[PDB]
Design a protein around this nucleic acid. Structure first.
Lengths: 222, 134, 119
RNA sequence: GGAAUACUGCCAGCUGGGACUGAGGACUGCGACGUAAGUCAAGGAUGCUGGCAUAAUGGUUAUAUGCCGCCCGUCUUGAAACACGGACCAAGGAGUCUAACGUCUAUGCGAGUGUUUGGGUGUAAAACCCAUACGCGUAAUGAAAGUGAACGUAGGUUGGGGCCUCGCAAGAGGUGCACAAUCGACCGAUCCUGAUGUCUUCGGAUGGAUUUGAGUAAGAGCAUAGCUGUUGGGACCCGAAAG
RNA sequence: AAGCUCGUAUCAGUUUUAUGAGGUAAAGCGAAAACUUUAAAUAUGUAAGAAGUCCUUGUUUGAACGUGGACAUUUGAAUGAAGAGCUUUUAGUGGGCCAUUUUUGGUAAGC
RNA sequence: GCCCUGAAAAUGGAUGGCGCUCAAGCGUGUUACCUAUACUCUACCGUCAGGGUUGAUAUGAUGCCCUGACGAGUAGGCAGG
């Protein structure tokens, strides 16, 4: 049994380069995020100081959680919850926003809470409840080899790469997204508010679109 | 789809052992077919005549190809001349065995085939006529 | 308007008798005074065919397969160009997308406030 | 005019209290902290200390206390309750045997197959051995007389598990089993055509057009055993008026 | 299931696009309400590539029909994904209440 | 908008009961709390699915091992005991 030292030296040298690559990638992503945010703030200020109004871009990505149980659903609402991978209650997925998916989101509205997620909630979801589907089998991520050796043919080779591809809808949103097994949240820790859940969020319930409080919901349901 | 033979031939079970090992650790599409063929029931393994073999040996490029049948090889009387070849099978009946070994050839078993061709090289597999009957 | 066996047509009656009125099928016969269509009906959860016999003037040709052909020819053109040069051409369609950022201007347009009206 | 605070949001900021769990069993992996060997909270709990060694812990059991639970079986798929059976106990008590066909699986031999009506022998209703016959299969079709299966490498085209060749792959090319689709060839039935000729009416050469059949187009069957299906025998068991 | 030929990137109680159908104004505006110029849906059918495109043109130039090569997989919208099709036959079943959503017809009121 | 009348008999009785009047009633707003065989995390049993293992000598190859998702049921079906 030869190859007693050369292999250890070569592997320990090969990992020490991927580490630096990942360091650089993350250090650049951070600058990109903070620059975009500060730019949007300053643009709003410039419109105000010039006597005008600056409108933003419609949100590109929603997060959808299934709220109601599995009984007494008609078939057309029952099929969209399958095409969305929302098979059991308190399960969540991301969804790209287009005119083709918005109608889906409006067809199952009385059974979901959905909205617009932020960097912090995406990051917490992936770091705590992130599980990949590797040939099957809901594998916990827990490592970068797992992500790279199954999602690397699209330039994704770490976990911040995945979070980035999700938060800024890139070219491989579909592949990165179907990589992630649907999220299995728990009930909210502080409760729901709302004596009764099955009214519209506008009208004092839970289902529908809240557009910004999905973060306060999911950070506690997480 | 099958996973273990319904027969009780201990020798057939040894054959399945050997070819499962070969199918697992060789990665050649030959063993994967012969192991599957070693599971069929008797109505699904028609006998392959000794003249269908001669008919197959006339295809251009089949001079020294080893012909493999995974059932029974029966005799034939309507053919007169017979090439010089080597055939591997489960069983040869008396007439077919005599004809082959008299025309100069050789009659071998399946494990010896597996040792003369661990990946089934320069071979040619034959199947019998299924639906000449019901 | 002259129909052949196999073409596609839709039913359109120019009162209270029967209402398919907007389906689409294939001509399986053309007699002198009429034409005959078939229609796959959902019999619970199966598709069983009914053979209807319309008249001449109660049926018109269909344009439900013109856009496919026109788009295939436009794609032939685009791919001829994409072989004539090295070009990313992006033949696929795309679903309608969400808008981007903008800056409206209140120069000749001051926002006029309006409240709801009484009774 | 210059600050402050509130509400909303973020921190890979710090830091106390409580409860449940401790699966795995030599090493291997990804990391971190160190100039350094080494160390660690990093692929699942260890370290220190006390009491007891027995009815103390635990199992069984009787009762008490808190909450829960309408009498079993059957038949009507509901007031779903009605209605019918049940006093108690022991023993008995109901899909079995056969004949004839058919699917499926195992075994033997395989263009064959089948010893056991009978004969020979026997350590005697066992075991062993055997001649001639016979059935099914290897040829079909017409009402019948009757006739009765290769132009060719056993065919032509498309698809096709493998194998072969070139190649690292990726691919590309060759030959292609079973089976499928379509065009043809051969046998019988059917409509014509009608030769070298002959008991003067016999014979049916040759070339043709329809469909047709569980036809041919290098055989796949026979016997035994098991699980089962259908029909007939009293036929899952008891219970009734009759000629 | 008996079982064997086939998981074949093709399928789907879903949305989008093209287009028909409701045509009700409730877009919305008229040549003296008098439109059809045209929405937004409400569930309503069909279609969205390899059995496809071009070159070249022999028969009963446009109609079908034959022919000899070019055509590549971000190969022609979105979401999900491996459980559709023949043969054998083998077991049970073959007739009913409550509610909602349309539609028709109803009288003391039910229906 | 609340409140009274706006008909209804006959063994003694029913917002479930006691009782409740700036409510323990009615309309509404904001919070805190109780609680399912439902949701989350962990262990154990089985079933199904995907991978490894002939390497001798080692104790069983219808075995041994690693990973994952799952678990109602009458007529009826298949399997192990």
């Amino acid at each position: 049994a030869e190859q007693v030292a050369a292999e250890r030296a070569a592997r320990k040298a090969a990992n020490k380069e991927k580490r630096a690559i990942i360091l650089e990638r993350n250090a650049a992503y951070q600058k990109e995020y903070e620059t975009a945010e500060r730019n949007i703030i300053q643009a709003k200020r410039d419109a105000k100081a010039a006597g005008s109004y600056y409108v933003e871009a419609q949100h590109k990505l929603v997060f959808v959680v299934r709220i109601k149980g599995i009984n007494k659903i008609p078939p057309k609402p029952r099929k969209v919850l399958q095409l969305l991978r929302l098979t059991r209650i308190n399960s969540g997925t991301f969804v790209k926003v287009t005119k083709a998916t918005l109608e889906l989101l409006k067809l199952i509205e009385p059974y979901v809470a959905y909205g617009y997620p932020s960097y912090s909630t995406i990051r917490q979801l992936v770091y705590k409840r992130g599980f990949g589907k590797i040939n099957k089998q809901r594998v916990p991520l827990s490592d970068n080899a797992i992500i790279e050796a199954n999602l690397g043919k699209y330039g994704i080779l770490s976990i911040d790469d995945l979070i980035h591809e999700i938060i800024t809808v890139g070219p491989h949103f579909k592949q990165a997204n179907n990589f992630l097994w649907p999220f299995k949240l728990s009930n909210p820790s502080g409760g729901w508010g709302v004596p009764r859940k099955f009214k519209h969020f506008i009208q004092g319930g839970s289902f529908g679109n809240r557009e910004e409080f999905i973060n306060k919901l999911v950070k506690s349901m997480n | 789809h099958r996973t273990a033979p319904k027969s009780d031939n201990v020798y057939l079970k040894l054959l399945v052992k050997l070819y499962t090992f070969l199918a697992r650790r060789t990665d050649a599409p030959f063993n994967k077919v012969v192991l599957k063929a070693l599971f069929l029931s008797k109505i699904n393994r028609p006998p392959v005549s000794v003249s269908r073999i001669a008919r197959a040996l006339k295809q251009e490029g089949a001079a020294n190809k080893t012909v493999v049948v995974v059932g029974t090889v029966t005799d034939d009387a309507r053919i007169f001349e017979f090439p010089k070849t080597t055939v591997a099978a489960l069983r040869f009946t008396a007439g077919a065995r005599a004809k082959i070994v008299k025309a100069g050839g050789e009659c071998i078993t399946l494990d010896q085939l597996a040792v003369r061709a661990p990946k089934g090289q320069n071979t040619l597999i034959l199947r019998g006529p299924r639906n000449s009957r019901e | 308007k002259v129909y052949k066996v196999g073409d596609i047509v839709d039913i359109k009656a120019n009162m209270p008798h029967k209402f398919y009125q907007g389906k689409t099928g294939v001509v399986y016969n053309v007699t002198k005074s009429s034409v005959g269509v078939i229609i796959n009906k959902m019999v619970g959860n199966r598709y069983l065919e009914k053979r209807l016999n319309l008249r001449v003037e109660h049926i018109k040709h269909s344009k439900c397969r013109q856009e496919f052909l026109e788009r295939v020819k436009a794609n032939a053109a685009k791919r001829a160009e994409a072989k004539a040069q090295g070009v990313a051409v992006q033949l696929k369609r795309q679903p309608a997308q969400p808008r981007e950022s903008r800056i409206v201007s209140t120069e000749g347009n001051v926002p006029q406030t309006l409240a709801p009206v009484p009774y």
